[model samples]
Target: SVILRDDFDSYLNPNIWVECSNCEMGEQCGTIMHGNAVTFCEPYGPRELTTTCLNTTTASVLQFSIGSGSCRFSYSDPSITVSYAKNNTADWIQLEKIRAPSNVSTVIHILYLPEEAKGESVQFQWKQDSLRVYEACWALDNILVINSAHREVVLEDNLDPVDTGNWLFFPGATVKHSCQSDGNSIYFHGNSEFNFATTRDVDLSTEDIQEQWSEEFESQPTGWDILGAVVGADCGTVESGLSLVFLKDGERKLCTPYMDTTGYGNLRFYFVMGGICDPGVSHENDIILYAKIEGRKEHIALDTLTYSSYKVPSLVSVVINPELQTPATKFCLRQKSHQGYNRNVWAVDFFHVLPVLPSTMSHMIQFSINLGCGTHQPGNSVSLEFSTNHGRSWSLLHTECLPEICAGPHLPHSTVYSSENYSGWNRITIPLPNAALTRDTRIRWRQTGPGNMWAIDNVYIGPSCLKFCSGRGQCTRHGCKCDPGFSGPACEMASQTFPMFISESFGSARLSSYHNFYSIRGAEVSFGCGVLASGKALVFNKDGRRQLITSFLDSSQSRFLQFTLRLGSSTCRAPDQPGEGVLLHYSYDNGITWKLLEHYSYVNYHEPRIISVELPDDARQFGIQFRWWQPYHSSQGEDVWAIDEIVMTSR
Candidate 1:
């Protein structure tokens, strides 16, 4: 039984009563009596409030919450003494000395029972010495004593109206009832509200497909192929399904069509043999399973069972070599007999070919380290190398060098340094490569410069989800094939907009929006200057009213905005003059208002620049708009603003 629940919900009821010495109830003895907690602390002299326990068994732990109002204890000073004594005994055992700052209104406290003070019904008391400094009041609530081994509920609501019958407290102790979050909880006393799920209905269809195919043969063989009509249901059926029986087995073969088992594949089937033969006695018949490539000469026996092996039903499952198996492979069950007994027969049931799910499909390799320079002055040069075969060989995946300016040509196998050193510890994330798909995959970070002053911490390598693509599209052997409009390393981007130029346009490809080019007024605004790395460049033109453009923004909790632009002019009379060409403004509220992002007058020709900024805290709507304002309307082509690449991301 639970000991002394005594949430002090109401005035202490039976088997308990508060003792008031010089303290007043609800005024001095207790704070606000809301049926949530019972507080007792005397001002002038020593005071005590005690509650008796009914159970005489041992208790493993004691837990309660403490709070401070006007009176509290200093950091290392004990504000009150909690002691327990056996029934009708004068001996008192100190349980705990709790304390809280004057400003702290609530804090949970716990005490584990010592070996010597565990068993026996005892009277627990909260005693406070005379006021050491001034008017100091302490609070005690959510009192619970129980054996640690008996705790089961992860989020228990012990103070609920239905469970309040378990509480007991003294009548003199002023108590009050309160909500879990607004007041205090019987078990957990914290700022967060207590929410628990009594019944949960999970939709497993939204989860990843670990096992794609399974056949129990309970209804009928759906995908299985029978070479001869020699297989039938001779043996009785289980609830799962009917079993394929071989009567007077001569020769029978059950084959499966080609299956793709790239990630993982395995074959499982239940077989039962019947005969009047003793164990270890050789039979003239054998039941064997074979795996072979459909069009290849390669064939391997999975397993073999004979009458002597076992006459009883059994289940067998084996893993298929992914390297040897492909979409052109098939698995077959072959049953052959020599001069065996007529009853020497076996039945196969519930054949299942499933993908063997590995403990983890992807791995996240993360590390936090501070890079520095040493005698070799490696600077900030770092490379990530991985090995799948127990570190027998390694492959370099990425290399980085932090700097203001690059020092040397980027090498395929190495990277050079520019920044002298890296300050503070920064985290780095490296994904596990396809070659490191197995459990034996290992990775390491190598400082190419061999410089010292490297302080590393929280280094971790662990398995992650196989669908690292955020489930936007399918995961391939190479990586993620982002869905139509999404693009990024993790396919996190919702829309990928690339610039297209008239010069780069071809027959059918030129008409593709992906090729880049937008229409303003009736004129087609195409790329002017040379294209960027994306093979296209943005060119803004004016037709009538300040051209207003809008695009979709993937609204995520992370409100970050980033884009790149290049200010250029094709045939403008004046290039570097201010407010002559165009003014670019960005907005978040559906073009309700706008903020000046860039102004182009006589801007330099083909000058590329990038900009990154945080969106307004409240700008979480799912759309972004751009307004291009020019001083004067020009039917004839004037100045052209070309933005090569623009990338916006949030997560």
Candidate 2:
């Protein structure tokens, strides 16, 4: 019997499985036929990926394709193993830890479940240790589990069905369940979701998470991205030491300081889920934590997001030096929800780089609950309590009775809500008092009074921002970003953007600020320098056949260039010859090719004028450049020209 099978070319099953501690799906990885998969860089701590309590009573064999990320895991990667546990409890039973494949090849591994593990339930744990992403990472694909059925049914035969026309016969002692029939006997296997030996097309991908660089969030939010730069998460004081509380929507980022991690052979970090709530406490309000160390020009990918009990998973990068610094490598948390108002809330307390790295409660007491017992039960009620100090003390802030749909003729203290006879459920929202909103705050529900069938789902409790960010942007845990025309915290105000892309007055005439925007070709073309006007204006001396080419004049969103140009000499300079002129050329291909834009012959001092050239739409694809060439120069200081007050705008 096939219990679980995943090809990983499609989607990951979220209901019965979850990957944590930095587990990510491989972008497009697998054998020729296989497409997608998941990878996990071992962390300094413990578990990175695992399955929910799976019923193994029927199936006890597990199989999967395991290999390296890009290359083989380097350093201590092979020492770290992926293990499995039983009964939803911790003590993980050691399985045969195979050395990472020698190359990028992923081979299939089969594990026959031990008799002791053939109980009610068991979990396969991808518990990695001391691995990194520098050189390469590790990946798991084509995962499958089986029930080890047919103790005696052999699909093949030495009776030579090949020549016997799909029929077989044996002469040895005839046993009760011994047979070598395949084609005709295969019908007895039954037609169902899975055959006795099923070739499942089920898809899946998974891995755990670990980081080479880590953050504790203990210090003030220095060096961390906050508020406008971030949202949907909070970094404040929790448990004395600071903890990064991650919620849904927006991005919650930590770890901004750049550190030299090249000395470390394998990039690795340890992370654990911490809070007063259950580590597996996620309903619609859940989370995702992304750890980045950098090096792969290829974008980072996060695959599986699972909700599991608080367990430590260490992240490490091998061969690849993840030798990344501050900006390049970062740690971020995000929730994939657009209508994410008040969602899941979890926290990260301590972190270790090969260093290692919470449980708790806080509540809002909001849920859509149904109360009924085939009718109305007299004095049937539900009581809710809260404790602000680690359950040491308690308070009753909310209490409620059954909705009309749950009307029964029962009495008090007689098994509350045993039978339900209702059309729908009622939504109850009880915001925790300000003082009751601490990390240690705990919430408890009390239901008594006979015949009261108390039921609830979508229970949510946590701080939430603007209910629905105006009618514009999508609401994030951090807040919503305004659509183009809005601003303010809630994006309630109409807004405007600056008009010009650039405006260069050259007040200081500091050429260095241009970042080598213009270059000289033939000779040292003069600028706002020399004798006359004492450098108050830009002056291009016509000493020889010189050229000035402007670099990337950005037209990011389709813009035109405008600048004042004096084609000929000024008052203190002599006039240009008849044929001497400055030819303007432009190119959208970053100068690989240039087309003549305009030709400026000798003009009088009053010719100090403005030139405008409307760029074609293609200019928006790349930066445009301009060249001013004095191809035919007269004498020195004679055919000079000047440009000033340059501006570019989309309009």
Candidate 3:
């Protein structure tokens, strides 16, 4: 059970927390922070933040997000020591101390609460200190204290997804996910050989960014508008995306969408200059990366290429000019030559405009193996290799001797053999760095021995918490072993199979229109098309139309209704994304008839609410329909509404 959860978005709750000395809410960091955070810019002695005493008799964990920090050799790093005391008269015992890289970027951290501190009237303190003049500082946010053990089960793949006994290739691997003895791992004869199958590259970096638009070139140029540019092949390597070729002379403009660069930085990507640039053709091969602001005659040139490599494409990053940091439109990469010619071709791949990445989070690769699980042969060997370049080539992770059978647990020596195991299942764990970006970080294993008998099973990768365990439980092979007071696959449900999730991202309809409708104040009712929200949300109007028949949700009456209503900007964590509140209703037999639950017309206080509404005693058997209904309104009515992440649950 979570006892305390503070986001530090508004002012820190004065009742539950105390910020002494120089602690204050801050956003002065390099990264596009998610939300408001408490920063301790200590210029003198220890800056302390203490929690009001709370009974944590059953609490076992303490979690919070901190910024990636940095320190200089001449100055001390900003460090926070966690300490807890049972009461004012009791001794304050220290738990752990932490520091970060010099720059402040968001990173979540989870620590344990000693059993002794899980008592009545327990208080916690975070004391930060360092060299006074260096401005040794740190930022903290999203403090959560709960009673849960957190870990992750990368994969519990029984290989059932793969058919049996068939040598079929799965995206990243040439795997026969079939039965080998009692498990899925197989043994080979000394004479036979085959490498693991390769998979379609995955851009691991995409996994890091929350809201991002990319030009992978797997398909045609839709997100990107191009003139003399088109997607070539995969370019025979592990690249960010498909190769985008820009040949032909004169104007070759590949422009991307209008973006809100409010909390973002850097246009990082890869490109290789090739072909020939004639000295006789004037400014023949000059390629300029430009930033364009709509309706403005002035366009900012970001970067220029003076020479050509005609070979491999490496990374090229351009810092976005601060002037265009507003809602500037079109990031245009162009090659406008003074003379038209057939020379100069550049291959661009993997264009990303995202926040700065860390050297990031907890990611690992682990797999299980069992010795002597199949046919036996001695003095053989096997090796595994990893590639960030999608599989055009490889890097040996490890290669060790195998004799019909190698021992469980320990590898012979000098090898990345691998993460946990029991019952003849040996789990080997390896670290996957934050540097592993999307152009597809991959893994493939091979054997070179005359042969041996070994079986592999339950291969896993990524974070220790599957899907972050919904930030509630430890994801295990069996499933999410929820905490003492939570349930569901991701530990979503907090009660005994009670609270149910009721959400409609409105993802089903994004373009021209939707099944639900339009107009109010002046008109009767019309089925509206494409009422907009940030990324497919339930919008309020089509043109200047107001909604009459609102979007309905299916939920039980007895539970609580919670959803995020984004009516304006700044309320959302994404400062650039926001657009909600209107009316609420509950119905017994579908939405044919309705009972008003909440009504907001030209009314109510402005609402970033994980807003909660009780379903009343309307019947708990479900099949009940709830919707947001807004009547017609005038122009000054300001009927702007949207709903996201709706959920229904009971205590």
Candidate 4:
């Protein structure tokens, strides 16, 4: 009988005579007649041999060999127990264990190269501790193979994508993880590892770099300006160096004379010099400047009634030369009151220089004088003068008049001109045949010599026009004019002003011996006189009242230093002479108030007084009036301080 290879237990049956090919049989068999095989032959018909292919679900057969002399079965195959595993990496999928059952008791197992293992890899192994068999010796060679059951084990290239083009079996390849707007992520189901290539993008724009460039450059304030001319007349007896402090509202803070405690000297005047205060320090209480007279003490606060209604304050500075002379000057807010007072009056502190007269004894003067044409008189004049040299060496000009005289009544003054107001482009000018002369032609005016206060602007002497610059303007050689586009022989013109007429008419008054009424100076004349006349003299009395007496205003000496007030009649009321003279008011401090000088009456002569008004830079409107009113009992006389010619101009 023939037997199949699956009948390994067929020998356990006791009825059938079995034939064992490798074992000696106990009963005699035909195939055992050969003595060689009789030793292991059993009582069986014949030894059966069969050939069958074994199929499995996990393992694969790579090679199978026939029975050898050792009666052994040998094949090259993979061990099914070797679990399918992904290389230990983050980007790989882990494989679970699989079961592989063998069909033959005597078999060699191995793993065949799966079809899915297309890359550089061969999957081959044997079952764990299943390398041996008993019936026929089975052995396996180290050949990796896979059987038909393992078709589901999809295998792929376990290589780095970065090295994919190259023939290299890399362990891993970097894979970048990215996301979109509100993007989610693809997480591993079982700690999966990925081997892939990656590429990324970048951006470029920041805020910090811009800030650094901006801080490198900047700007600041350099200087200041003085708005307009300020008038000051004091009464208190103080030293001779007093000045009126002017404040400037400039782009920056105050500097020099405008600032307190600066190294600059007090804008010295006839009055005594005192401490100057800065406006910024005391916004309301700062004393602008003290036009203090020797022994005369009165604290005039800034914003007080005296200097309050002045123009807007500004800061100005002058570079004093080593010779105690000023050459270059800078103003933050350059101002000019070269015309007439716009509203009430605009003023500034004379903190640097005192006021002065514009004429003298030697030089006779003549200009169109108008009493009411608004702007007339001296176009400019210095209201104080006291020649200590016996009419020779004149030191003080407009003596004791600074702090008391409010600029001569408006005459031929511009309404568009302002005191405290200032602008960039403006100008004013006064014609002067003579100026810049050295004939000891000292300019002077006396408010004490029995007369009313007078004004002298555009003071041009010595074959030239213009004394000091008009208002805040400066005087140049030959003619008086502002800077290039500026006007006024002294640079007192506003740039924006149109070519219009200028007029400043200061009202008129009568002469009297009232104690503290008013001190008036006659008008300016080319030929001055001591006693022109008594009744014909112009007077300055408190308001319109001639309470005291009309003294004589003598224009006899033809002194340009004196105002020429013609008197038609001579009342002759002196202590003995009983003549009509003039009275003068003088003050060392700025025009805080006034004081009496002498009562002039009883005289016969014609005196022409020069009067004028200064308008600030930005004066809007200007007008002049020949206003005169008779006192209750006062009688009128013919041609008393008559004024003529009214002219206004700009350069």
Alpha-carbon runs more than 4 Å astray in model 4 = 1-288, 291-297, 301-572, 575-651
Give the better candidate number (1 or 4) by TM-score.
1
Give residue 383's lDDT in candidate 4 (0 to 100).
Answer: 25
Per lDDT, the best of the predicted structures is 3
Give per-residue lDDT, candidate 4, residue 149.
Answer: 26
lDDT of 3 by residue, 200-267 (tens): 22334434444275567765666567877666643333264457766656567788878776434446
Error of 3 at 638 (Å): 18
**Alpha-carbon lDDT, every model:** 0.45, 0.44, 0.49, 0.24
Please name the candidate that would achieve the greatest TM-score relative to the true structure.
1
Q: RMSD, model 4, all Cα superposed?
A: 50.3
lDDT (10s digit) by residue, model 1, range 1-651 = 356665556455457644634443343323332234454444456656676654536665565666654445445433677787776476877766655345545554545455455556666777764554435556666566654333211111222232332222222121123211212222201111111111010111112323456665554465667643243456544214466655543456677766664443445566666532212223346666777776777667665665543444554545454343455667887766544434555667766655433334445444444445222233445556553322223445332211111121111112122224234444443444333333223344444442233433333344432335543433433454565876665565667532211122212223235322222322233445455335554444444333424343434354544445554535322233454455555654323234556554545435655545565644444344444444344445545554434444444
**Runs with alpha carbons beyond 4 Å of true place in candidate 1:** 17-20, 27-45, 65-68, 71-80, 96-108, 129-139, 153-651
Worst 10 residues of 2 by lDDT: 188-197
Per-residue accuracy of model 2 over 244-292 as CA lDDT, tens digit each: 5554456544444444433221232223333343243332333444446
What's the best-to-worst order under lDDT?
3, 1, 2, 4
Model 4: per-residue lDDT, tens digit, 308-426? 21112332211211112122322122222112222222223333421121233122221111111122222222222212111212232211211112222111111122211222122
Measured against the true structure, the TM-scores of the candidates, in listed sequence, are 0.27, 0.24, 0.26, 0.17
